[PDB]
Nucleic acid binder design. Structure first.
Lengths: 155, 392
RNA sequence: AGAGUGAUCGAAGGAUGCAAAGAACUCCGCGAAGAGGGUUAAAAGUCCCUGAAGCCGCAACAGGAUCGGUGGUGUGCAGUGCUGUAU
RNA sequence: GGCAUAGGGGUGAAAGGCCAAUCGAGCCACCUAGUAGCUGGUUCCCUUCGAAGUUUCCCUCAGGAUAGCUGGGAUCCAAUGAUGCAA
RNA sequence: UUGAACAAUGGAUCCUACGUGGACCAUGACUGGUAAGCAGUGCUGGUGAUGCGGGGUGCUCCGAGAGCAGACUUACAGAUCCCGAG
RNA sequence: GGCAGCCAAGGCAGAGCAUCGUUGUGUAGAAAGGGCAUGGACAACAGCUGAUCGUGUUGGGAUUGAUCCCGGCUUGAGGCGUUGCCCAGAGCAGAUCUUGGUUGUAGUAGCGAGUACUCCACCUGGAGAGGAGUGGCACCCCGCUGUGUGCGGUUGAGGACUGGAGUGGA
RNA sequence: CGGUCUCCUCGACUAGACGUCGCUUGUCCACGGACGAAAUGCAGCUAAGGGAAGUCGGCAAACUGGCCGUGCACCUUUGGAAG
RNA sequence: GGAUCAACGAGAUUCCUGCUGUCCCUAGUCGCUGUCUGGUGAACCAACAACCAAGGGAACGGGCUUGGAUGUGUCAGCGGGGA
RNA sequence: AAGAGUUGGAUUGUUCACCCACCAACAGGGAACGUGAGCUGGGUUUAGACCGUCGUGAGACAGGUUGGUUUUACCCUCCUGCCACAGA
């Protein structure tokens, strides 16, 4: 249990956080974390503040068919980007918990960077949508599990 | 099965890739013939559309019903500041066409030309031509300069004069310059090169290049209209009111075989902002800068000295305050747009072509609304003492 | 259970552990969680014996225009095992 | 609102309309796993042998039975090479 | 001269379970039709059931028939290059 | 296929052993030709198993093949296997196959009738908005910098709708 | 956005239980926001000159429109036609 | 049932007038869409795939053969093809 | 010699036909008799109904007549514009 898919050299230099059944769209949280992957903790939090303020965007690289082109996607050599608000807020909470975990472990979180942020498709929750001609179709919520490890800088 | 009743085809396939062109400046892909028997001279200029008005002029065309009659003609007012000449370029004749051999620059280059090498100018350390302009004073850089000139005078079969248009004198927001290159035609190659060198940092005017009744070509970009449907993009006739889910469309975008829509079928897409050359435009007048003349738009009939800027200024443009041209008819693109004007290529020998034009009247009334008056003094004299005037 | 006015139709649904010993206390958070720390042979964590395929995330590595394909063939090059091995 | 007319029956200013989104015979359970010369499917390996779309009769012409070709089991017989020398 | 040649692991006696009973192609052997990649027949062989070499490609043509390999040689047919062979 | 020159081998007579010869396509179909494999009965293996069964997963080896054996890991027994023979609900890629779980499509099409909202205030863990924003500062303080046209509810101030065959009252 | 029984039913314009607006009562709830907001669409409008030449076909839209006064033809079953 | 037939008809047809974007020949404008977007979010369909020409072929290929092209991935559209 | 062109109308659902004109001319054809997820729905070709002829009848009729739901693209490609990466 409590098993992450990231083996650290010295977990005494790490900070870990996990989220389960987060009730956020997966396909947006995936792009969010893929953008956030290698960034430092300060870069990450500033990036999230700016995405919320819509000053810069989140590139929709894989799960982005139909997404609108943006001038703010030039930051990542792409053109399709968006501003997934609920997932940015949920990943903010995730990284805040990981930073609190760092502080508990006795670690400067401002020195750590994001190593292995990750999202998984959780169990889908069904609802009923009502189609023409007397049909019924599902509305499945597509939630996610989130996990993040912060690893202290190596200089 | 054939179509029962014939019709011509919708649109030109010569202009086929109807896409938003890449550059906002008109490209000259063909200059006139060289003819070394002639004296060295320039063959193009950069004007800027300042608006549009109409003139009165007597027609000279024997055999016409309007011969010796006073006609009214629509003209485009093209404000043309003197072009500053910064640099020469040589072109050698390779079996792959022309190869630019060497680009010689001037000594003191204007910062409005230096702006052309920076997307942002105020965040840059403005280092354009710094080491060039220093080494050019320097003696060993004087060598690389006299050696580039001698390189052109020996191998270059085409010589072109690089000139900037000075977009800043138009008082539009832009402070940059439009840099183009112009063929010096006529004369030998050495004669061409030294004619060009004489004009380094010269700020040459448009009447030196063009005459006042001569035919030119207007190269440039047309007005943009955005994404447009087949009805206005290609001019197809729209379907009957009775149609389902659309009238403003093309009904048969292809036969079953070939099993692909062809490039010849009208589709919707970008309309406007294409590169076009409007050829055979007669120059009806070359007027001097209003700062020096103050009476440039006065003709044989006028009794008050007036300038071509109308009452209330040109709509969306402002005052015209530089050497202006009166092109006949319409030129591509909106106002404030940069139009290259080249010497004609599709030359005729009608009187319509080889005709002297004298303007008898220039309409300077208000184009913002309906202007009954050609002059603010005319407006005063008609609408005499008002409340605001009697309060002044 | 549910459906049909009704006559009638009519499902899905088994397994914690030897023992509830069913997760004390700490940090963070509004809280759920999470990070520790525990019970236990083990989390086996009230979704609980095991947990396949299909599908998906992530990391590493290898490639990436062409039905010039999957697959076959005979080599090669990298990575990776296995078997044997004289004095 | 109450009540009456029920399935080969009702009711209809007649459209074979209407009788619970059902009507040239409602629906419901059962006979019933109806029958189908017709359509579709029919689950491991190797080795060996290996066809027919032709005959006749048939309310026969998308099918059968009947010969023919195709496999197997045989029975009575037939047929079926091979010593280096020396001892 | 055991009275023609050649061949021949064969002759006799049975029993028995199936599939098939839509065919098609080729040829002065033809019939109907102007004809048909049409319809109907005859002899034989093929396709169906059959891959392989050649005909660029092609269920039917030409060669040849198919256990797994090695060497040699060829059939039909090929050698400007694609593509082995001047 | 012991009554054999001797050892080695074979030694289950539809087997095996030695030599030689012939022949290898195949739809439908067949084989009293030969095998692999599944559930269980009767028997044998004084079979294996908490010193870790079975399942599964990943590598390796064997096999013409059906398939068989082994190592690693999971897992932990509410166990399993090999041989002979017998009894079968005994092998899947298809059947618009049945039941279940899924995928792309796709963060797409959409969520557009009934005219309409706005401001301040309070209610909040937060809602005039930051994760330790940044420099002094050694947390206080003083500076600088960023904040999405902005969740929900309810007073009040405006703007509007219902407009008595009402969005009212029974 | 369908359907579903009855009762009460104000003021102004008006012939009015039409239609339009307002006091009383009730409500601002229908997924929203930016960008003047492409093409296409579904809706509302206009359009010079011509006036069915469009189309199977004047389809669709347009013209007209309330009231007062004068007045009204053919045909007729003597009633009408007739606004 | 035959023949006239007033009145009536969302009946079928023809002509005239007036009127008109039906048309010559389209243009402009506007609300709601779409378009970008925060929250939410399906389904149809799916052998595998998805650029052509000719050829041959179950006689109309995305795959085969011989050629010609072809960098990968987008966004809004689109109705030729996917018999 | 296939570059450009080859029209406006009346009747008819019509292809065709036939007239009225204009013109340089008003050529002939193909593309799944190109083209319905482009339109229309006039015609053929349902269910309703009338007439004529046929049939004892129900009903039939290349005999006539009237009235009669034409659905879906957001997938892939082609085409149209648009953009980035070029990393393999």
């Amino acid at each position: 249990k409590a098993k992450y898919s990231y083996t650290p050299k010295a977990e005494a230099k790490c900070a870990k956080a996990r989220g389960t059944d987060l009730r956020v769209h997966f396909k947006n949280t995936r792009e969010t974390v893929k953008t956030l992957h290698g960034m430092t903790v300060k870069k990450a939090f500033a990036y999230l503040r700016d995405v919320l303020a819509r000053k810069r965007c989140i590139p929709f690289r894989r799960y982005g068919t139909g997404c609108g082109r943006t001038p703010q996607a030039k930051e990542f050599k792409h053109t399709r980007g968006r501003w997934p608000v609920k997932s940015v807020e949920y990943v903010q909470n995730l990284l805040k918990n990981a930073v609190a975990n760092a502080n508990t472990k006795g670690l400067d979180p401002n020195a750590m960077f994001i190593s292995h942020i990750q999202a998984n498709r959780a169990q889908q929750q069904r609802r009923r949508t009502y189609r023409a001609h007397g049909r019924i179709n599902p509305y499945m919520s597509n939630p996610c599990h989130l996990e993040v490890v912060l690893v202290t800088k190596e200089e | 099965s054939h179509r029962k009743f014939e019709r011509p085809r919708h649109g030109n396939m010569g202009f086929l890739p109807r896409k938003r062109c890449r550059r906002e400046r008109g490209r000259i892909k063909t200059f006139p013939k060289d003819d070394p028997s002639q004296a060295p001279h320039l063959t193009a200029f950069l004007c800027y559309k300042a608006g549009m008005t109409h003139v009165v002029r007597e027609l000279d065309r024997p055999g016409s019903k309007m011969h010796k009659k006073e006609v009214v003609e629509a003209v485009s007012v093209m404000e043309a500041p003197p072009m500053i000449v910064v640099g020469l370029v040589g072109y050698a004749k390779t079996p792959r066409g022309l190869r630019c051999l060497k680009t010689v620059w001037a000594q003191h280059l204007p910062e409005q030309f230096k702006r052309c090498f920076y997307k942002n100018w105020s965040r840059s350390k403005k280092k354009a031509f710094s080491h060039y302009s220093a080494n050019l004073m320097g003696p060993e850089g004087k060598k690389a300069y006299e050696a580039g000139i001698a390189k052109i005078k020996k191998f270059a079969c085409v010589v072109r004069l690089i000139a900037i248009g000075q977009v800043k004198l138009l008082r539009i927001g832009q402070k940059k310059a439009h840099c183009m290159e112009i063929q010096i035609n006529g004369g030998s190659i050495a004669d061409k090169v030294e004619f060009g060198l004489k004009l380094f940092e010269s700020s040459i005017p448009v009447d030196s290049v063009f005459k006042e009744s001569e035919v030119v070509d207007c190269i440039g970009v047309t007005r943009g209209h955005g994404f447009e449907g087949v009805i206005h993009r290609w001019g197809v006739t729209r379907l009957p009111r009775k149609t389902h889910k659309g009238l403003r469309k093309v009904a048969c975008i292809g036969a079953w075989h070939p099993a692909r829509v062809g490039y010849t079928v009208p589709r919707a897409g970008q309309n406007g902002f294409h590169h076009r050359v409007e050829a055979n435009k007669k120059i009806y007048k070359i007027g001097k800068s209003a700062l020096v003349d103050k009476a440039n738009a006065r003709c044989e009939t006028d009794l008050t000295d007036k300038t071509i800027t109308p009452l209330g200024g040109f709509v969306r443009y402002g005052i015209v305050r530089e050497d202006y041209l009166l092109i006949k008819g319409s030129v591509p693109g909106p106002i404030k747009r940069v139009m290259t004007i080249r010497k004609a290529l599709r030359i005729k020998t009608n009187k319509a072509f080889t005709e002297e034009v004298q303007v008898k009247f220039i309409d300077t009334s208000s184009k913002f609304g309906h202007g009954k008056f050609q002059t603010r003094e005319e407006k005063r004299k008609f609408m005499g003492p008002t409340k605001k005037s009697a309060l002044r």
